[PDB]
From a paper:
Although recently, organoid and in vivo models for HuNoV infection have been reported, these studies are still in their infancy and most of our current understanding of HuNoV has been inferred from other cultivatable members of the Caliciviridae, such as murine norovirus (MNV), FCV, and Tulane virus (TuV). These viruses have been widely used in structural, infectivity, environmental survivability, and disinfection studies due to their genetic and structural similarities to HuNoV. We provide new data to show that conformational flexibility in TuV capsids, for which we have yet to identify an environmental cue, varies between preparations, potentially frustrating efforts to study entry. In TuV and RHDV, this increased flexibility appeared to be caused by significantly reduced interactions between the shell and P1-domain in C/C dimers, compared to A/B dimers. While the purpose of this is unknown, it was suggested that this particularly flexible state could facilitate interactions with host cell co-factors. Nevertheless, the effects of different conformational dynamics between A/B and C/C dimers should be taken into account when considering calicivirus interactions with receptors and cofactors. While it can be assumed that the mechanism and purpose of P-domain movement is well-conserved among the Caliciviridae, it is still important to characterise P-domain conformational dynamics in other HuNoV surrogates, such as TuV and porcine sapovirus, as well as enteric strains of FCV.
Caliciviruses are a diverse group of non-enveloped, positive-sense RNA viruses with a wide range of hosts and transmission routes. One area of calicivirus biology that has gained increasing attention over the past decade is the conformational flexibility exhibited by the protruding (P) domains of the major capsid protein VP1. This was observed in structure analyses of capsids encoded by many species and is often a consequence of environmental cues such as metal ions, changes to pH, or receptor/co-factor engagement. The ability of P-domains to undergo conformational shifts according to environmental conditions plays a crucial role in infection, significantly influencing both receptor binding and entry, and enabling evasion of the host immune response.
Author numbering:
A (entry chain C), B (entry chain C): 2 to 429, 435 to 494, 497 to 523
C (entry chain B): 19 to 527
D (entry chain C): 2 to 134
Write the structure that this text describes.
């Protein structure tokens, strides 16, 4: 441990570089390691940016908010993260350099703390003083090297062990004469000289790659999973769409397709129903039918109540007098379906909340001649009456104990970025022109399964237009949604740019490029 | 260099282990390398199987055929291949162990030769004796270590340099009393102790990963790009389908989608035409129309003559009297299309070979009331008349100087494995039930762009059914097709297994599992 | 000839509250490895796993027995490879050591990235391999993740002249650093390295697919390549599975509530719903059939040709009234989801079924066109319940069946119900697997059983799988090979699943 | 204990002669024997065939069948069996030579095991590896 001081160019203040070990490192003997694998000597000499190792302190940020929270692991450094795929186990700490863009005419302090494994992080700078910690001042801070121990009770780690953390928060609030001033903080890492790997194994792991390579396909090349016959023509933003309740176009890094979503939305769009006894009260044209369940023959409450991939477009509460969904429908015979034409259809019975506006097995079709217990093709294709983008945007409700996709929202100050397609009318039943949005396309998150996301982190994506004269930035969450930072009805982004991986960020990260 | 002999268990012969340097290694001083990066000492001690380092000598194989041809590079060894992604450059040779499953009651010889860079490989064992080489005998061979030089005229390599090769062929034919006897040959590699890397760089490269990780999605989860509204329900084999001329479902590792193929086949299935003056001679119902080209407005001969992703189903030469394609068609108005219903359509004019049975802009629709210069929706949906699987299987001809996909064939003794879907009839125009095949699905080769193929090598895939009580093996070629080895009309493989990467093989490799 | 592909790291055992020495003589005698026996043939494919072993006390006969009284252990094994090779064979095995937390690959290419040795059939005999104890902890507790030894075909077995097979056995001794940690009562969860079987003959065992009729034959048939049965299904892991029971006789009798209406175009064929004492809420996740109730096949859409046969009679205060024979079947005679389906809906050929009345159902025969072949294929599984999986013997093997003759019931009355005589096969009897729960099977291992006839003069060898079936190695093909049911089973050894029984049944006499 | 190898006439294989003590012999002091009676020195030098010491392995024979089972006693050797009639008691082990008519173009293995008194013989070659063998 030490500190050195440098005078600033103009002599109007100083910068400090400090090296500290808040907690002693306990160098493992590695006596139980079958082999000890040395790293290339240059890997100890290269400080790379840490995944999620970037935060901005505004004068708004409270001394209660955690700015950075990072596990002490091979994932801290680019080359140890790549190298670890080749190894069964690892041992040893990291040098963690906190680079602070401070200034002598500001005021305020950071605290950085080492937190042992199986201990929770407190939302308080007062409580962080109970840990091994350092305090930095914004007037003089420039570089702080934390010698972060690998805190363990085992000779070396395998995967899936619980790890010590670095935590950074504001100790004392940022002050400046200017309202626009920010302290930018960046964390870099290299393995300590005592860092080792333990056993060569083939480089196939569940653990996420340190860099994600994205195909460079434009959004217009990707399927809209809520309207598969129509191409994506814009990325779209609308500040009133504060939540998503869709069951189609729902994917996650962890679980794959969730809700009633599928990776072949074009081959799943078609369904079949068996036509029931009876019709909706007051509307004898509105014959009931039950969607056929190949996946759910015995109608188990834990498996989906609707066929995999079948339409989740909305029509509002108790609104069949006003608007409907539209489909091609035709009766089943040898080899296919007969007399296929456009009919109005909807979910439920236009009255009861358990059925109406609910994603479940019972539908009505507005055709007066449904034969009882006969099968009918159902290909959803449009909407009719007073229907519009906002009615189609709100899906029918999920219900019961099946594994539906949850309702999701962007963090405060952010907005969802949608994959949007134009769905055309068709005329003599008559449809209306409407725009369909999806939260995500399966063709983007396909690539993300092939690389993985680091646990607890989000992809910051550049979206590149005209080769780079415009670049948008979005956060793609592992929970499936993609999101933008906005200031100030609908807003349109061209669909012929391409996604490029920028970096890993925390869910709490504020995107610097603003839409 | 040396040789040692071991007596066999029963004393009925001997095995030899030989170490040889056919050509001297020239250890680079690395004086121009900015840094020299050491490998983990255990990487020099691990012999892994080489990509494509596996061949079977039958008594059928000629002393003219090249059995193995391998570039001396970091791609020879699993851990040097993974490590090289992290580095700008490399230097040094490889130990190459040729493991021969020989026997004392066989006869015959191998030759192994080192070939300098910018020299061609001869198809002759007589000419291989002009190189630095070794000869092995099948009675006594067990292990041969070749100390293979890194032959260069530069201090160290960057990517894209031309490399020295190991070549193995039969020197003298295999003989045995048994007709079933084979010599199995396997090649393993480790870097020589003088092997080094030169400069740490972020691990992002065009160079293919040594192991491919495949999503585990079943074929039924994947789109059929020749019939997007219908799911894949079987993988399929038919020994009469000796070639593929399709323009849809054509993908390559190198170029992506080729011919008229797309990564969103469901969003590209729809087209529009402008209705021309006149009709096919003798059939006044068969009104001409031109497919609209958004991608080709000025009708450039080098850009495609048909809209991206539009139907390439066959109907035979001069056969409109016998069979047609079927579509939904409707006239364009405000917001969409009016009076949409089923019509017969086809390519060309049912007579001239430049138009009939040709994938080009001019079609006819069998509707007597097409308004001149009005636009019509076209959604292909089935086939009519004498149409069948074999008529749909042969696409319309490619023509002219646009960048079409070439006609491809399996190597002799192999057969294509097809993604197959059932396309149902529709009835009063009346369609017929037909099965549509695709050569490949975009959802499988999506994964292969995210890993790459080693240049000149093919993926051997296991296809895993019932968790492993049955496993098929297929070769997936970088040229887009997938293929099986067959002995002894159509054959059906279930679509609910999953693909698993087995290994890299040469195009010449004979799959050991036979369908 | 001693190979350590990965180094053995000697634990100090500092942390151990006691360190328990083994008898010095256990380190000096190599025993056979409990499951370490496997076969390679010219048919055995490249990249196939022949042997998988956890590196644990279970690798040796004496340390597997001793481990029953210890909480924990440390140290590796010295393995020796005994190869019954021949002068004409060529080929290679690969032996790989997998670290504790790592998944086993499915190809030779990925397996060569582990610490390994390549073993040629000309020189592999008496080769010694150290199996190291890989850990990051001072000693193991029970239930810890363990390193594996994996043996795979690297180059396939080929022969000059004649087509031999090679049987490979491992032998083992613990390395000198091997120790145990803490005395516990001799009841611990590791399988005994020897299973002792009580000498009960097959005829003394129940047939769980026909409880009233004794087993008369062990049976083999080359066309019975599949079992889909729900009855007679027992595993060492789970006990009785898929609607099977440990008292098949007591479970044989169902009741059904008669249901309104009748089969379409067949008004005599009245519906009923089987009553479900164990599933009264009618959950889709619980079985749709009473436990232990008949799973006899009666063809597909086959009611005009063949039916099942039972005694039935309506419930009363005094038990059941006017009990006599009827034809019955599962579901409808048409709908694919009901017909030939193991589910709650049945029909009975009795016009007299009163609505909401409850009827006894005692299955006891089959009628018309029903044969052995049709009884052998059970009604289909359907829905989300824990039904027994459809199983096959591995390539080149046949199931051994427990067989009983079911005699024909005849009536002389015009239109009276009439049965045809049939043989009923069960995949396993609960009376054989009885002792396997107490002993355990080693992880991923098969029991090689001797079956002993004529005082020892004829010995059939069968492989008893922990998934609940016996198989035999067989040559030729036959639709009626009989083995006497008056022998007894004797445990021979544990074997890998892909071991090929040497003792081949000449299936065409 | 030792092993020696001889090349076959034609050099098409080898024969092995092995001497082994699977279990240590415990030479009795004979302190309680009233007299100790020596055998003629030539009786230790004569290997006779054992009563029941002959079996044929066909490819039919299972690795579960016991081929030979013999008590270690004066009845093993012709002259010790005749001599023992003249004596009340005996002590000491036997050299047992197993002569195998093998060939280099066959395959397969024997196991030979010493089994202590009051222990049962298992019908399994897997279980015979638990004994000195």
């Amino acid at each position: 441990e030490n500190s050195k001081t440098e005078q600033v160019t103009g002599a109007t203040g100083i910068t400090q570089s400090t090296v500290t070990a808040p907690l002693p490192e306990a160098v493992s003997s590695l006596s139980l390691a079958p082999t000890v694998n040395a790293l290339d000597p240059w890997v100890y000499l290269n400080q790379t940016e840490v995944p999620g190792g970037t935060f901005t302190v505004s004068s708004a940020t409270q001394p209660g908010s955690v700015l950075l929270e990072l596990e002490i692991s091979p994932e801290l450094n680019l080359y140890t993260s790549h190298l670890f795929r080749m190894y069964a186990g690892w041992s040893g700490g990291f040098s963690l350099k906190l680079l602070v863009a401070g200034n002598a005419f500001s005021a305020g302090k950071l605290i950085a703390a080492i937190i042992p494994p199986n201990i929770e992080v407190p939302n308080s700078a007062y409580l962080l003083t109970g840990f091994p910690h350092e305090i930095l001042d914004f007037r003089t801070a420039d570089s702080m090297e934390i010698i972060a121990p690998d805190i363990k009770n085992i000779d070396y780690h395998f995967r899936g062990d619980k790890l010590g953390k670095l935590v950074v928060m504001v100790y004392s609030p940022l002050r400046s004469t200017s309202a626009d001033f920010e302290i930018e903080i960046k964390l870099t890492s290299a393995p300590l000289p005592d860092f080792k790997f333990t056993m060569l194994v083939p480089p196939i792991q569940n653990n996420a790659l340190p860099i994600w390579s994205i195909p460079q396909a434009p959004p217009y090349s990707m399927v809209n999973p809520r309207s598969p016959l129509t191409p994506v023509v814009e990325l779209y933003i609308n500040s009133s769409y504060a939540t998503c309740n869709h069951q189609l176009g729902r994917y996650t890094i962890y679980q794959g397709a969730i809700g009633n979503s599928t990776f072949n939305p074009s081959g799943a769009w078609t369904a079949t129903c068996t036509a029931e006894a009876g019709s909706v009260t007051g509307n004898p044209n509105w014959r009931y039918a039950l969607l056929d369940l190949p996946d759910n023959p015995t109608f188990d409450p834990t498996l989906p109540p609707v066929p995999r991939g079948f339409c989740d477009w909305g029509s509002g509460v108790k609104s069949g007098n006003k608007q409907h969904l539209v489909c091609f429908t035709g009766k089943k015979f040898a080899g296919g379906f007969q007399d296929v034409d456009a009919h109005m259809w909807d979910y439920g019975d236009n009255e009861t909340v358990g059925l109406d506006n609910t994603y479940q097995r019972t539908i009505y079709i507005s055709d007066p001649s449904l034969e009882k217990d006969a099968q009918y093709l159902v290909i959803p294709m449009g909407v009719s009456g007073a229907a519009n983008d906002d009615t189609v945007q709100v899906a029918p409700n999920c219900y019961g104990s099946w594994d539906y996709a949850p309702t999701v929202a962007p963090p405060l100050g952010e907005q969802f970025v949608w994959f949007r397609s134009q769905l055309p009318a068709s005329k003599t039943v008559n449809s209306v022109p409407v725009n369909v949005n999806a939260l995500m396309s399966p063709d983007l998150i396909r690539s993300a399964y092939a690389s993985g996301f680091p646990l607890g982190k989000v992809a910051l994506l550049d979206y590149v237009l005209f080769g780079g004269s415009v670049v948008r930035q979005f956060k793609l969450y592992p929970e499936g949604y993609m999101t933008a930072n906005t200031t100030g009805t609908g807003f349109i982004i061209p669909a012929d740019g391409y996604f490029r991986f920028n970096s890993w960020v925390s869910p709490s990260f504020m995107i610097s490029s603003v839409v």
